[PDB]
Design a protein around this ligand. Structure first.
Ligand SMILES: Cc1ccc(S(=O)(=O)O)cc1
Ligand SMILES: Cc1ccc(S(=O)(=O)O)cc1
Ligand SMILES: Cc1ccc(S(=O)(=O)O)cc1
Ligand SMILES: Cc1ccc(S(=O)(=O)O)cc1
Ligand SMILES: Cc1ccc(S(=O)(=O)O)cc1
Ligand SMILES: Cc1ccc(S(=O)(=O)O)cc1
Ligand SMILES: Cc1ccc(S(=O)(=O)O)cc1
Ligand SMILES: Cc1ccc(S(=O)(=O)O)cc1
Ligand SMILES: Cc1ccc(S(=O)(=O)O)cc1
Ligand SMILES: Cc1ccc(S(=O)(=O)O)cc1
Ligand SMILES: Cc1ccc(S(=O)(=O)O)cc1
Ligand SMILES: Cc1ccc(S(=O)(=O)O)cc1
Ligand SMILES: Cc1ccc(S(=O)(=O)O)cc1
Ligand SMILES: Cc1ccc(S(=O)(=O)O)cc1
Ligand SMILES: Cc1ccc(S(=O)(=O)O)cc1
Ligand SMILES: Cc1ccc(S(=O)(=O)O)cc1
Ligand SMILES: Cc1ccc(S(=O)(=O)O)cc1
Ligand SMILES: Cc1ccc(S(=O)(=O)O)cc1
Ligand SMILES: Cc1ccc(S(=O)(=O)O)cc1
Ligand SMILES: Cc1ccc(S(=O)(=O)O)cc1
Ligand SMILES: Cc1ccc(S(=O)(=O)O)cc1
Ligand SMILES: Cc1ccc(S(=O)(=O)O)cc1
Ligand SMILES: [Cl-]
Ligand SMILES: [Cl-]
Ligand SMILES: [Cl-]
Ligand SMILES: [Cl-]
Ligand SMILES: [Cl-]
Ligand SMILES: [Cl-]
Lengths: 296, 267, 267, 296
């Protein structure tokens, strides 16, 4: 029998006056309790109980022992209570960062399903991209981050699981002079709104121009805000690069076109990043599952 | 004495700087290095603004402007102001980012931002910052188009709802929390916290969570047809959007030009 | 339910404990593991005391006593009390360490110490602890034997001196700081801080630093001939040394025996 | 010329009305200042100064430039001031741990000499031994620790420099029955006061008994306090092991003897331990030097 059950039973025995009554009250087997008490007495090398006409009383030894037994039972209960309070607070909240692509399609659908499964959980969704999320992830504030990244850039102490392989698209105002272009070379005369990338503003288009043997793309402006980007492009002759999800889901869709080139652009891999050592709550694990699920 | 050329490298020789300070700056930045960095940023950015301004006074309109914009600004006036600015000043490099008060303050103080366009409570604004009113905005309560409370007209009717606490100068959910409080209601029941304005409309469209947002954002997002605004007849705040700057920094001619175009289109 | 055998291993199977708690305990202890440890220590130490006490009630005088002793105790009464105790109780294992209030408190609370012998201010003593007066001590001011102020008779004459702030229940230098304050003097000028009573006499003997120490320590150290006590006629405190225990823990027969010998020799 | 000197000079020029007067006031060479200003003007592509009958005035351009120059000069001064405040507080205090051997001989002599060289420095000497000092050393609270250690036990991220090779001695009451012993084997019947060691209470004597092919030494008691140890031994028949310095320097010398065996005991190496990456203040470096000096 578990020692704690045996101590709890002993406290009950003192209270109700009988080993048989204690076992029944606590839903323990009588023979198992009687054996467990005997085993404990053999270990202590003294009897804890003496028979009387109508039950058992504690012996002098059991009296002394009981003072400790009560402290041990209370302490076990308090420990369970403190841990429950601390685990409840840990398990009851999620803080993570999400990139625009996740934020715009999967995240909305994932949160509703997540909430049905984990009704008692608060979510704190931050705007975030690597490597800005790297240090927030590193101290413990962020439970995980969801972002495009180049696998070989990710800090060695971070775990990384592929979430979805994304699309990027070149976007301009709906009547842009270069809308019919099929080659990146045909865009050399255009000016660019450099957008946010893990490798810095304009990293994608600059890398594209480079691998195609073109000069540096002409900087029109730097727009780190994906929120602002579609509107800014819609009201200019600037071209930009954005996640396909943002092109599909923005307030200026009717004022914009994509320029589908026969030249290839990257398909950024979006990763779930966590600190490797950290243990993961049920809810955080469930949310990731739900986000995975809706990232078809 | 400090060598100013070395500062623009620290942000990116060091031993001479460490010897000038007589303290370690690198080990990652030491505790001294972090304290040192805010100063080095102001010195470097001021030095660049000084040179750019002189070129502008000579008719060479080149240089840099870096600024932050809160969501309503970014969606309405900003595309039009950036377009007009680019026509008048074709050779100035502009860098726009998202930002909200008070998160923008340290970046106004170290000169990394020329200005920020953001809602703020006037009495909360730090004394070293100037605040020029730009816009008086409108806030609405938003839910999925078929929300159970889509036809509610009083805050009281929304008591049992869960909220996507949205971001604000006084913290997430501050407008709804204060509104609930002023109207004699208990704390708004939180469903989740959503800092991201980009993500918020879609999160609300695919849940039963209510939120508060600038009327601009309600009228300009990708989920408009899946959303509604609650037809409240209880009054909500109208936040003032300001142009915020560190007051003692002289505005460059180019940044003054952009602020002017922003003021024009906001009006 | 917890398995008590596993607790005595955690201090030194785990997955069953982690599953019982439903929280990670190891990763180094997790934040839960640290919170868990104080409880596990009390449970394990109480379990051992319970068994030892029963053997003692049966005339088997074996078991363990672990206690802390402040410097004056350790030097005067303790050698004589441990000797007398060992004669009466030859088979009990005793473990003595240095310790002072309030540093000893958590170790009284988690059962790792049966008791502590230490100076304390009665009104500072935490409500779950019992305090039994043991000794009223004497404090002296000490300096190198040829100190410029060796013949000073008033605290006022020591104003310009530098102090080896020595350790105390209210913090380093607390007795001299409070004495200076009560006598209407400025803060004592600190020369250095010396936590170590073992090192203090030798540090004072080979510098011009004054300190305060228990009269016992002054009369019992290896640097006596190189030291003096300042013949002050201003009054200094006489700290009470207590036997401190966590009150709700039943004292074992063996520990009661040792406390008795300690009380005898202190008297 | 340093740009900051040039800006400071420019501010002075505005104030005193003349480049010549500014150079003299600031103790700068006139030709060097005139060249530095010209160089700056060439870089700005505008003149900062215009000649008048009795000096120079700022041009319109210099006026605009001066507003920035003043902010830059002030900021440089404030930076120096903040760093000075932070460095002064860093350099003005030392916190370290010291073991009994150090604490009893070298430390006393080292502190006086240290104080003459670094009068403006507060020292905070903690009682300490490895590996208890290991974590205090690890977070930043301790600047260094001075302790016996086994080289191969020391945490890999800690630097360790040998300070002194120590002696340990077996000690008993002055008339101990085994005082004339010459072999460890002759002490097998004795009971021991287990003393503090880096490897745990009684580690040294237990290791000694072991390498000599003897049984476990008989435990009399555990005395973790080196302060209490000499007195406890003096009033018993217990034997112990202690640093030679403690045997030489304690209040019970007349009541104690050492038992100099022909069998060898260890000579623990005392190390200065620091975190490897951490930069070291002049004072802490000086104190270590002084402690090294007095550890002959
Ligand atoms: C065990 C026990 C003790 C005493 C009695 S009595 O004789 O009936 O009082 C009966 C049974
Ligand atoms: C079974 C049982 C045992 C003892 C008694 S009594 O002697 O009347 O208390 C009654 C009934
Ligand atoms: C008569 C009687 C039988 C059995 C017990 S018991 O051992 O406490 O369960 C008490 C009294
Ligand atoms: C450049 C870039 C930015 C963001 C993303 S996203 O993580 O798929 O939204 C992909 C690529
Ligand atoms: C960045 C990004 C956004 C959207 C998509 S898509 O889901 O493949 O259309 C891919 C990548
Ligand atoms: C921006 C970006 C991120 C990631 C990749 S990927 O390495 O092909 O997954 C390519 C481009
Ligand atoms: C609550 C709130 C958040 C943000 C704005 S905004 O500055 O107009 O985008 C106004 C009001
Ligand atoms: C100088 C200037 C630039 C741009 C415009 S705009 O065409 O109205 O945007 C008007 C005037
Ligand atoms: C400091 C300060 C000034 C003003 C206000 S307010 O009146 O609530 O906006 C609050 C706090
Ligand atoms: C620029 C701008 C910001 C905010 C609004 S409003 O909130 O819809 O009134 C309108 C226009
Ligand atoms: C995180 C989260 C997502 C969705 C909801 S709910 O749609 O209001 O039930 C609540 C909480
Ligand atoms: C200040 C002070 C420190 C320590 C003691 S003791 O507890 O008597 O050793 C008494 C007084
Ligand atoms: C029981 C007992 C033990 C020891 C002594 S003693 O010789 O006075 O220390 C007296 C009495
Ligand atoms: C709580 C408390 C009780 C008593 C004192 S005392 O009177 O200064 O010793 C101080 C503080
Ligand atoms: C045990 C003991 C402690 C303290 C003193 S006294 O401080 O010298 O009076 C004497 C004896
Ligand atoms: C650290 C330190 C400070 C002061 C002195 S003293 O000059 O001998 O008083 C010695 C040692
Ligand atoms: C440079 C300079 C400017 C003006 C005069 S003035 O003609 O004597 O006033 C002399 C010299
Ligand atoms: C050298 C010198 C230059 C100019 C004058 S002034 O014309 O009288 O001001 C006097 C002397
Ligand atoms: C007459 C005169 C000569 C030189 C200068 S200076 O160039 O400002 O030093 C000012 C005035
Ligand atoms: C066991 C032991 C403890 C302490 C020292 S000491 O560092 O030389 O004092 C050496 C050996
Ligand atoms: C631990 C310790 C203390 C003292 C000495 S001694 O300096 O070599 O005598 C060595 C070692
Ligand atoms: C306790 C102790 C510490 C260190 C050494 S040593 O490894 O030989 O320096 C031996 C024994
Ligand atoms: Cl039995
Ligand atoms: Cl607000
Ligand atoms: Cl203008
Ligand atoms: Cl005190
Ligand atoms: Cl007793
Ligand atoms: Cl020029």
């Amino acid at each position: 029998m578990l020692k704690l059950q045996t101590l709890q039973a002993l406290i009950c025995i003192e209270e109700v006056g009988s080993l048989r009554a204690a076992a029944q009250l606590l839903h323990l087997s009588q023979p198992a309790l009687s054996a467990a008490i005997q085993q404990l007495e053999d270990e202590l090398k003294a009897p804890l109980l003496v028979r009387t006409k109508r039950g058992v009383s504690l012996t002098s030894f059991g009296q002394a022992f009981m003072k400790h037994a009560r402290l041990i039972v209370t302490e076990s209960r308090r420990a369970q209570e403190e841990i429950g309070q601390l685990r409840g607070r840990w398990e009851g909240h999620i803080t993570f960062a999400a990139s625009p692509a996740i934020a715009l399609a999967a995240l909305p659908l994932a949160l509703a399903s997540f909430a049905r499964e984990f009704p008692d959980v608060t979510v704190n969704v931050r705007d975030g991209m690597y490597p800005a999320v790297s240090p927030q992830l590193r101290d413990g504030t962020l439970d995980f981050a969801l972002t495009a990244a180049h696998k070989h850039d990710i800090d060695t102490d971070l775990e990384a699981q592929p979430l979805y392989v994304s699309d990027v698209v070149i976007v301009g105002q709906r009547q842009h002079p270069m809308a019919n272009a099929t080659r990146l070379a045909e865009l050399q005369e255009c000016r660019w709104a450099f957008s946010s990338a893990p490798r810095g503003p304009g990293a994608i288009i600059r890398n594209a121009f480079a691998r195609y043997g073109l000069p540096e793309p002409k900087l029109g402006l730097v727009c780190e805000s994906f929120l602002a980007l579609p509107g800014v492009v819609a009201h200019s002759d600037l071209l930009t690069t954005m996640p396909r999800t943002l092109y599909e889901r923005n307030a200026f869709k009717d004022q914009l076109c994509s320029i589908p080139l026969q030249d290839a652009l990257p398909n950024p891999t979006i990763y779930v990043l966590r600190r490797h050592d950290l243990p993961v709550t049920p809810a955080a694990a469930g949310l990731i599952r739900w986000i995975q699920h809706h990232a078809l």
